[PDB]
Amino acid sequence: AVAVDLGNRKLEISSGKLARFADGSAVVQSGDTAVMVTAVSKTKPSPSQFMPLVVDYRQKAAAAGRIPTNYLRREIGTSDKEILTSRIIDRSIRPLFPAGYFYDTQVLCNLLAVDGVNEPDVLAINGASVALSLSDIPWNGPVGAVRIGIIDGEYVVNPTRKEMSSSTLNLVVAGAPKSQIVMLEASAENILQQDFCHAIKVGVKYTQQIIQGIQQLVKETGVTKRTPQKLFTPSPEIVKYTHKLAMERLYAVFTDYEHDKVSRDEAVNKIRLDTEEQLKEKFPEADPYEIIESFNVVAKEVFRSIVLNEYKRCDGRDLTSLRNVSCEVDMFKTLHGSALFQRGQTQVLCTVTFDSLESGIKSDQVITAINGIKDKNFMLHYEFPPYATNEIGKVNRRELGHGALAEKALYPVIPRDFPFTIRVTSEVLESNGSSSMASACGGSLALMDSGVPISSAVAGVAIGLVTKTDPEKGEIEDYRLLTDILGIEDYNGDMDFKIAGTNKGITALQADIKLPGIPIKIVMEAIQQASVAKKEILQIMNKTISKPRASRKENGPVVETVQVPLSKRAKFVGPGGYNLKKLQAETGVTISQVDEETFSVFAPTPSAMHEARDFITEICK
Amino acid sequence: AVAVDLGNRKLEISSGKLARFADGSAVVQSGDTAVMVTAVSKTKPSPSQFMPLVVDYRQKAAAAGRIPTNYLRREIGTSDKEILTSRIIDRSIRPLFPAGYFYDTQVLCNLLAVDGVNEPDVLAINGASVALSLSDIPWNGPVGAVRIGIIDGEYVVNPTRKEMSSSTLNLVVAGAPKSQIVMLEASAENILQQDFCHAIKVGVKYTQQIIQGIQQLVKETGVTKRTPQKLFTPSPEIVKYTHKLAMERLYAVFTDYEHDKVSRDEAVNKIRLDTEEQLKEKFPEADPYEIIESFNVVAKEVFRSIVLNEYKRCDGRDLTSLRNVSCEVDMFKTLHGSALFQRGQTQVLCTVTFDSLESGIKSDQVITAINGIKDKNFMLHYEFPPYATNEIGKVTGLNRRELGHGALAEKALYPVIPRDFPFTIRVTSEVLESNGSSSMASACGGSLALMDSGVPISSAVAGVAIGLVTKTDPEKGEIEDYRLLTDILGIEDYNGDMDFKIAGTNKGITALQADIKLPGIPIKIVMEAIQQASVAKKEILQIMNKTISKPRASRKENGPVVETVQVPLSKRAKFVGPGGYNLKKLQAETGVTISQVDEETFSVFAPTPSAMHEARDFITEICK
Amino acid sequence: AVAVDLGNRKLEISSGKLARFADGSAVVQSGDTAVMVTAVSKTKPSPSQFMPLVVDYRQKAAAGTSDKEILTSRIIDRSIRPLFPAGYFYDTQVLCNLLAVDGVNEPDVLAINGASVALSLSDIPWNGPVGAVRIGIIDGEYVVNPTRKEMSSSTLNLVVAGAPKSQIVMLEASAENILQQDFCHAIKVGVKYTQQIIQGIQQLVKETGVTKRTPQKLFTPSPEIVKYTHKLAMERLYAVFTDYEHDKVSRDEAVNKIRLDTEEQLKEKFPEADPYEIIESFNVVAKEVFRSIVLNEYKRCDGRDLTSLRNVSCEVDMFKTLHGSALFQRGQTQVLCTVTFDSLESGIKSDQVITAINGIKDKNFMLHYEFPPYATNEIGKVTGLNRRELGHGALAEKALYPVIPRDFPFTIRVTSEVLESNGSSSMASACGGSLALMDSGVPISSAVAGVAIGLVTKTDPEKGEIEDYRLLTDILGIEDYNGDMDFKIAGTNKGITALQADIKLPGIPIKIVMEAIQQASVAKKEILQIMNKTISKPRASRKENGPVVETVQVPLSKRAKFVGPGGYNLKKLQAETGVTISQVDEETFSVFAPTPSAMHEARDFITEIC
């Protein structure tokens, strides 16, 4: 039992009482909110050639004093907030696992109690760190996580639920020992870069206090780590031989600036088949996966040596250059708003639909959208169809994560008290890069095209990173920050620093660091380098459209109130409102009784309003 | 971009702007409705020993009554209307893939925009044709698809939603080069055979114009097809050796007229085990699947040679003869209506269940719109349990086929269903045994159960399936000789060329679904099959009329009732309770439904008279 | 074809008409309720290396699978599974289709009988027929197969499945806190009726002329290679099971260490043996040694005697904001139980799969049971309730239902989560659920405790009858795995409220069942002594931070503005704060808030509207 003091908050950490069969377990309590986190890792290597790690943040209707609402089966699926919290925890702990740890691992977060004051998501990140630290699972160093808010210009750590509602920033920082940063998740109300950057420094300061608390609990408990029967990393001598075979061929491919996404992959694949064939004779006893992974290591090393040594990228760009950006608006007549955003070989189709205000709130049946409510009646829905990468797939977590990230980016510029629910759909028709950030740019374009009076245009961009690190020390010697990374740059790089905002502020941030932490200095520069790129993108978007249209499209939704006499009300509504629901199903009209005499009527198109209108007139005789 | 003019309708095709990563992609636009279709095919041979082809017609609903129902409510699943459209597209393109193309393939549809006037389903079929034509995926020929309706006696190509709502015919035709037919899907309001047949030839004429437009687009943009790693067809040397080994034994099996479904299958299997082991020794290098497929090729060709050469089927029937048909009603006393229809070794049990009109809607604006209200309060649910074929199957239920067969049988019976029936009519067809057209038996059994339940249907409906065996020149590809079979078994469908299911009254046609396994068939064969099925339909309707010929004078005495109970204004709070608790508590323990009709009166629906009696107890005990 | 008379009830059994393609099929009719049951078994051995048997009982009337259907499938699976031969590793499915229901005769019992007839007439290798009846107690008299009206007034709902020679195969009961002598008598009455049903089925089998298939191979280890395994691992396994310092994990790995050593030695001696045949031979030898210690020495593997309980510790009120909570530990099994109060109208609005199954419980009470994968140090998918967790939740809910008070102002929901598993977590859910209910302040009549009884028998293979046996109190996981039954029974200090016997043998005598009920009442008494020390009576009131209900009056001229267009304002408030405003009459709105703090914020909404 260790208590960590963070300003005016206390963080109680416990272990050894509950769930003792699990490989690791911990209970983290702040105020009256308690979260138990367990960690299980199988000792048999998984047949798949990667690290299978699943994080399931399990919210409970209990622990909050709420029996599940009106539906027979009491729990159905996964809420949006549950998936997002699971994603944050996964990104905080995944980089710290060793290389070649191909063992099935699961982290589960059970909510013991919730007081409605101290948020449990931050505790779940800390609990995952304690559970993994006390377990025998090989894991590298504790992780501290805090949330930073700005209330009246003051930087508050772990704000209460009341404080979040008055905060211009929602930043979550996960830090490793010696002030490294492992995860960044921000949702700001278009705040200045200086204020945003200070909050990161204050956050990393607090996560170091948590880490020292966990290290004390680990020392007292007396943790000993297991010895995995095998870490699946290619041997140095097989890797070195691969380097001799395919270094020159790979060097020519990545210096060939005429390659596109498919041509580059095919050219690399041709060397892969050629090289893997000759590797077997020299090493007949090597595992078939070990042969594959040796090529991936060599291809990654050659790819990174070019940008570090020569400051030029695989497509010939310099470190700060964007890809070609093209925008269109108003492509299909019947859509309320539309936009096609192209960034290199990434293409996104964004659509705006206006729905009724009543459809903003969802209730009953399933859990995924059980208590459906959004602050501004605005939601963004992100689709990543399998043909965007020329693939066959089932028609998930990544789509929901990217949809929330793009929705965070656009949320601060959405006007309040809009007549309708605003629903943006982003379809990734082609994918070679940050389709998630293109959804914010295209979403901004479609929003002004539709006539939504947004305060300012929003542009996002992704910043990559390549580092050189010695094995004898582990520190970062030199690094290159890349603007607007490709898919191969993100795959072979060290982070995907996605950040969006207007031309005068920052609205969203999601840093997916693949290294075991990076210095605050690198994070500081990535935010600056993205500010320059974002301004360049916004100038391209502004030429396509610079201000929202003075009105909505003529074929857009319309709301009007009909008068139904008291004598004729029963005929109109029908038995238990059967005629109302029948009308809303054949036509699109949504009818809601404002008053015993009047019915507000919402038609998504002027055609529906006429079609419903004759239904009302004949019913009223 | 190519524009195709179909009468007064305009079709626009284009490619090269959206989703350039896909193997093939196309945008098909009519009016303001634009549909984008994508084709992707893997270059690695699938581990599966057939052609995995999946068609997914997605929809961000705005032609479903302009209610989004997008990802905001997608974690429920896929609508039934989406799966039906995916089945029409799958049937239109599957026959044109080459034999042995064992490669994973997916066709996806994306409704970029829908204006609520032009239906996007037909555009999605044409888009799949264009996307496959421009791609490098080996696909034999372009396909044109139109919808034909009849409004005031005039044929209309691609009718709008307004015209579709006043049309006595909903026919979708997919045509191949040289006026061949690959897909037929129709539902009619009991129209004459001559009117129905004229719509097919009108439809095929329009699909040839579309094929002409698509071929122009394929010429304008260079299209080079890939060379597949290998096409999975048995070696001609292996096939001819299998024929020398199993022709006599297989011929004896197929000329044995005392076999049933199971005994015939095991007799064929016994030859399969004996032959295949002999094949392995002769051809050690042969693939394990090559041995299996070669035997299937020989068994299929021996089976079809008997129908071609001797005009006799494997069960001794002639080409026109039906199987034995038996009917039965009033199986169980408690059911509102029931029937046990049997044809050959296919057995189907059909139940009619009345319900409240209010059970049609779900009180949720979305979800209800996803599966809209049926025009008449009439739906058919079709079940294909695993024991119907003596196999172990998943219990999740309602796969694509069960949803399609249920839709086919529902539109077969829809034209005769009366209007303004006081209750919701639910028909459930359960297939207890299957050796043939259970879907068409569900229409015949469904009409028997409907008549027994006392629903005053206008007339009885019977369905039948017509098979086809052809002799095709190997080089020209033309059909030389063919035989049409009436009321085919399952083996004749498996080894045949088409599954031509068609239902109707004794004076008209109500539904049709032709599942052609050939890369197109001449229209003259389609007309002959429609006429041959007309003869068989009359024979089936004669047998069913002996069991029952007219609907019963009234519904069963243990059937549902509806009546209104008055409550005073002062007593509404105690009656309904706080938060409506009392009403839903009464429904939980009685099953009745109480609806606020007027401020003073409530309508009570009770599934049984006894349930009404219990419900009336609550009202009176509260009354005191 | 064959009619069976059970007092005033008639059972009609027929075959040969419907679904003739299935391996076996039967129709069972009582009154106007008919049930069709089919059985299919593949002739190709399954690769699973066990017996894959799925029972799927489905109600055809669409208006996924309701919880009643899953519970019925569990009873049917329990009634037929033990009678399959050993080594029958063939995929097998049993489907039950309700052709008609009259609303008077319950089709669930007919489905059990139909499954026995369909298996009896089929060619699937299956042991003797099984009869099944339901016994109720109406105004002091014992009724066989009571109707729906009689079941509502019954103090007992007991389902008995019997095998030939009055053996009991399945027992599953829920009683309204009834005496042990009344419970035991009802079992005797039920077994007598199941012999009459078996007589009818045997007559139908003889008339039909059933012949059984010969399976390709019965997957049982060879006797000569099992004997060699005994010569290798006997002494080492004996030492492991006589070491009383082991816990669940250390004992498992000690046996596993012997297993790995033995597998290599077996492989060289029998290289021709199937790799699974080596695995099962060790499983047989280990099971034999484990039971021989109980029979010969009357001492369990953890050092206690046949009647001793495991260590029991309880604890209540562990988190301030929970309405009620309890932590029940029994040996290495740990369960955390929570109580939540919501409104009476909490769960009844739209979207019911079938009518009359809307969200109203009999006492506005329900129990939800969760079995997370870390309870056994395992990895698994966590979304959605499988069949076992639905069955265990229903068993624990039946155990607590009799003592739940009526007319409680709030809907009571109990959640049990198994943090550790080494035994009866389902019965620990009844004990912990009882403690949390008392801590939460709901006035339950008495404390309820549950316990599981094991059984180890020695039967000669010459005839198969039971020579001698031992009944074990509060079994571990290993004692259930290597034992003969999991006899779970719960009740208060003066009665029985629930029972679920999972017999692995092909039937046990009625005297063994009677003794298990008596041995369980002694153990249940000891548990109730420990639980009473922690908390012996419900708290005088609920926690101060619990739910509160207060009415708010709104005038007619203000009704429209307050409710919003189509009740939008009220729907919005429920979405964010969680409070619910329901109309009571033309002037009153009942407000429910999970906490008094959330009520204060909610009251600021009406005042803001003012």
Side-chain angles (χ1 to χ4, degrees), chain C residues 222-273:
Chain C
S222 176
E224 44 113 0
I225 77 87
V226 152
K227 167 180 267 297
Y228 189 64
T229 310
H230 222 81
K231 254 41 87 174
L232 291 184
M234 206 288 291
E235 301 201 0
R236 290 169 79 189
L237 280 161
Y238 177 73
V240 167
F241 290 130
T242 53
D243 189 8
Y244 315 131
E245 326 295 331
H246 279 319
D247 80 290
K248 164 188 193 206
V249 172
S250 72
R251 189 188 302 116
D252 281 357
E253 93 195 0
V255 179
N256 196 290
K257 172 140 168 332
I258 307 169
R259 165 187 278 113
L260 272 36
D261 288 39
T262 309
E263 300 307 84
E264 261 74 1
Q265 318 211 59
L266 280 175
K267 260 140 207 310
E268 58 89 17
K269 189 57 159 17
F270 313 110
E272 56 301 3

Side-chain angles (χ1 to χ4, degrees), chain C residues 176-177 363 398-406 434 437 442-448 491-492 497:
Chain C
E176 211 69 29
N177 212 19
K363 271 171 179 177
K398 277 159 22 164
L400 280 157
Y401 173 87
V403 302
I404 296 305
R406 298 212 154 265
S434 192
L437 282 164
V442 48
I444 62 160
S445 308
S446 180
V448 167
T492 70
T497 65

Side-chain angles (χ1 to χ4, degrees), chain B residues 215-352:
Chain B
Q215 259 153 356
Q216 183 192 324
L217 188 46
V218 171
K219 177 174 38 83
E220 283 179 5
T221 102
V223 170
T224 298
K225 297 295 189 177
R226 76 176 72 165
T227 295
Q229 197 196 295
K230 64 162 314 181
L231 283 183
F232 288 92
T233 49
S235 168
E237 185 45 60
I238 269 67
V239 152
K240 90 160 277 163
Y241 185 77
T242 306
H243 189 89
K244 203 200 57 51
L245 272 201
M247 192 264 143
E248 315 283 351
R249 336 248 299 276
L250 278 161
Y251 180 77
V253 167
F254 290 130
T255 52
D256 198 2
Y257 314 129
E258 58 92 19
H259 274 314
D260 83 281
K261 170 197 186 185
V262 178
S263 75
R264 184 186 301 116
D265 265 0
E266 322 307 23
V268 174
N269 257 298
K270 192 167 104 50
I271 319 172
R272 172 185 273 114
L273 281 317
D274 198 331
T275 301
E276 281 192 2
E277 285 61 336
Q278 305 174 238
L279 278 169
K280 291 168 168 7
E281 175 224 271
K282 190 70 169 83
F283 308 109
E285 100 295 328
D287 200 34
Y289 167 81
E290 207 189 335
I291 311 276
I292 290 161
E293 185 54 40
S294 88
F295 187 87
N296 294 10
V297 152
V298 170
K300 173 165 165 161
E301 98 197 333
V302 165
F303 174 89
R304 289 155 70 98
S305 81
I306 284 139
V307 197
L308 288 163
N309 292 333
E310 319 175 35
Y311 295 76
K312 269 200 98 77
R313 297 153 86 167
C314 57
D315 66 340
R317 268 187 303 161
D318 60 68
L319 305 189
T320 283
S321 275
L322 287 166
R323 302 182 272 182
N324 322 87
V325 173
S326 325
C327 321
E328 190 179 343
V329 294
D330 253 26
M331 317 282 329
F332 305 96
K333 164 176 227 50
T334 37
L335 300 182
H336 302 141
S338 45
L340 188 64
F341 191 85
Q342 170 113 69
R343 74 153 92 251
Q345 274 178 295
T346 290
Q347 186 176 33
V348 162
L349 174 68
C350 295
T351 311
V352 168

Side-chain angles (χ1 to χ4, degrees), chain A residues 471-489:
Chain A
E472 51 255 45
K473 213 55 179 63
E475 325 286 45
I476 292 178
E477 276 110 4
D478 53 357
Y479 54 94
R480 316 274 176 266
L481 285 163
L482 324 175
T483 288
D484 212 10
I485 43 169
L486 294 179
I488 185 158
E489 278 162 14

Side-chain angles (χ1 to χ4, degrees), chain B residues 429-604:
Chain B
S429 307
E430 296 122 303
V431 181
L432 316 179
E433 286 168 77
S434 100
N435 195 31
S437 196
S438 39
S439 34
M440 289 291 102
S442 301
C444 315
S447 63
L448 292 173
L450 274 155
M451 255 173 306
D452 181 57
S453 78
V455 178
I457 64 175
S458 79
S459 194
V461 167
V464 70
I466 309 293
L468 175 77
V469 168
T470 67
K471 190 38 172 83
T472 300
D473 196 285
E475 283 80 67
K476 328 297 170 299
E478 231 73 71
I479 286 171
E480 319 184 330
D481 220 357
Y482 63 94
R483 318 268 179 273
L484 289 166
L485 326 171
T486 288
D487 224 16
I488 42 149
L489 307 167
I491 180 148
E492 310 186 299
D493 171 35
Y494 174 83
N495 281 338
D497 284 332
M498 93 174 160
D499 217 347
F500 194 95
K501 294 134 161 185
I502 170 159
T505 323
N506 81 306
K507 83 199 180 91
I509 303 184
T510 57
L512 159 72
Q513 169 172 313
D515 177 68
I516 292 122
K517 290 175 249 329
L518 282 179
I521 54 162
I523 168 168
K524 97 174 305 277
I525 292 189
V526 169
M527 312 290 111
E528 288 182 11
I530 293 181
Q531 170 60 35
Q532 174 152 324
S534 198
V535 161
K537 170 181 56 169
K538 306 273 216 314
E539 282 157 15
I540 289 161
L541 279 167
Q542 285 298 336
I543 294 161
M544 305 163 21
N545 285 341
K546 293 188 282 205
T547 292
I548 171 164
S549 55
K550 59 183 174 67
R552 315 211 327 198
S554 53
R555 308 185 281 279
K556 292 203 193 178
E557 322 62 35
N558 50 35
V561 277
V562 50
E563 69 208 69
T564 75
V565 46
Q566 214 92 354
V567 287
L569 276 99
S570 73
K571 250 287 192 62
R572 301 226 307 91
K574 194 184 198 251
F575 181 19
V576 189
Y581 181 73
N582 281 73
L583 290 200
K584 323 230 187 74
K585 170 78 127 32
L586 174 63
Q587 153 210 85
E589 68 103 9
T590 324
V592 315
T593 285
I594 309 89
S595 307
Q596 231 287 9
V597 165
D598 203 14
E599 76 284 299
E600 198 110 21
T601 191
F602 283 72
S603 150
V604 193

Side-chain angles (χ1 to χ4, degrees), chain C residues 111-176:
Chain C
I112 313 167
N113 296 296
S116 162
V117 182
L119 273 165
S120 283
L121 299 171
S122 88
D123 72 317
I124 303 165
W126 194 63
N127 278 345
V130 160
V133 295
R134 163 171 295 121
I135 302 294
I137 299 173
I138 292 90
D139 65 317
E141 258 280 23
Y142 295 67
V143 184
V144 47
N145 284 339
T147 71
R148 195 168 80 91
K149 287 278 305 308
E150 298 172 334
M151 278 174 60
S152 92
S153 318
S154 199
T155 64
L156 169 69
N157 190 310
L158 157 80
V159 180
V160 193
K165 302 195 265 277
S166 273
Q167 308 291 88
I168 300 190
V169 162
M170 180 267 327
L171 270 182
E172 196 253 353
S174 74
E176 211 69 29

Side-chain angles (χ1 to χ4, degrees), chain C residues 283-551:
Chain C
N283 275 40
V284 152
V285 165
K287 178 169 164 171
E288 210 284 331
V289 170
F290 176 88
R291 301 158 137 263
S292 80
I293 280 147
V294 181
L295 291 155
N296 289 341
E297 310 179 19
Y298 296 78
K299 261 252 185 300
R300 338 251 291 266
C301 59
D302 65 344
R304 58 190 158 129
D305 50 59
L306 314 185
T307 313
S308 274
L309 281 171
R310 291 179 287 181
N311 320 285
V312 175
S313 41
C314 330
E315 181 179 351
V316 292
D317 170 0
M318 296 110 49
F319 299 107
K320 181 177 313 303
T321 36
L322 299 185
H323 297 162
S325 46
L327 197 77
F328 191 87
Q329 174 109 43
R330 164 194 282 145
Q332 277 180 283
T333 301
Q334 179 176 58
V335 171
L336 159 73
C337 298
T338 317
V339 174
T340 315
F341 305 135
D342 219 299
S343 196
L344 286 176
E345 34 259 35
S346 148
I348 53 202
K349 291 216 134 205
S350 72
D351 211 327
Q352 67 224 251
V353 161
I354 56 199
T355 206
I357 74 155
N358 53 296
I360 278 139
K361 301 315 148 59
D362 182 317
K363 271 171 179 177
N364 293 118
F365 167 80
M366 74 237 78
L367 195 140
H368 172 87
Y369 171 96
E370 320 217 78
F371 199 87
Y374 53 77
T376 36
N377 203 39
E378 222 81 5
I379 294 175
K381 190 302 298 293
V382 304
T383 288
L385 227 37
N386 67 339
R387 284 171 159 229
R388 179 179 162 283
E389 296 156 62
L390 216 68
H392 277 9
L395 175 60
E397 196 223 73
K398 277 159 22 164
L400 280 157
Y401 173 87
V403 302
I404 296 305
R406 298 212 154 265
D407 84 308
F408 199 68
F410 303 112
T411 289
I412 305 152
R413 176 156 186 270
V414 180
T415 302
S416 311
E417 300 138 81
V418 191
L419 315 182
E420 314 165 29
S421 292
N422 197 25
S424 192
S425 32
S426 38
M427 290 309 69
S429 296
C431 312
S434 192
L435 296 165
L437 282 164
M438 269 178 297
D439 166 46
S440 85
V442 48
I444 62 160
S445 308
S446 180
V448 167
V451 66
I453 310 290
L455 170 71
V456 169
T457 65
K458 156 68 53 198
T459 75
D460 69 317
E462 192 73 18
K463 287 93 55 170
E465 83 266 57
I466 293 176
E467 316 177 332
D468 64 329
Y469 57 97
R470 317 271 175 263
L471 288 173
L472 326 170
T473 287
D474 220 15
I475 45 170
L476 308 166
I478 187 154
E479 308 192 297
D480 165 43
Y481 173 73
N482 292 317
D484 280 320
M485 57 158 190
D486 221 49
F487 198 93
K488 303 194 207 48
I489 174 153
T492 70
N493 68 319
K494 70 179 202 48
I496 302 179
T497 65
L499 161 71
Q500 175 161 301
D502 321 275
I503 291 127
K504 276 84 222 190
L505 280 176
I508 55 173
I510 195 149
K511 67 153 313 170
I512 298 190
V513 164
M514 296 307 135
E515 291 172 358
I517 297 176
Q518 176 58 38
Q519 183 162 322
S521 83
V522 171
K524 169 188 58 171
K525 226 64 58 73
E526 307 171 27
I527 290 160
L528 287 164
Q529 283 342 284
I530 305 164
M531 292 178 23
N532 273 343
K533 283 181 307 217
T534 287
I535 173 158
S536 70
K537 54 184 282 192
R539 316 211 328 200
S541 54
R542 320 178 273 276
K543 285 200 195 2
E544 212 55 86
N545 38 270
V548 60
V549 172
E550 183 192 3
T551 89

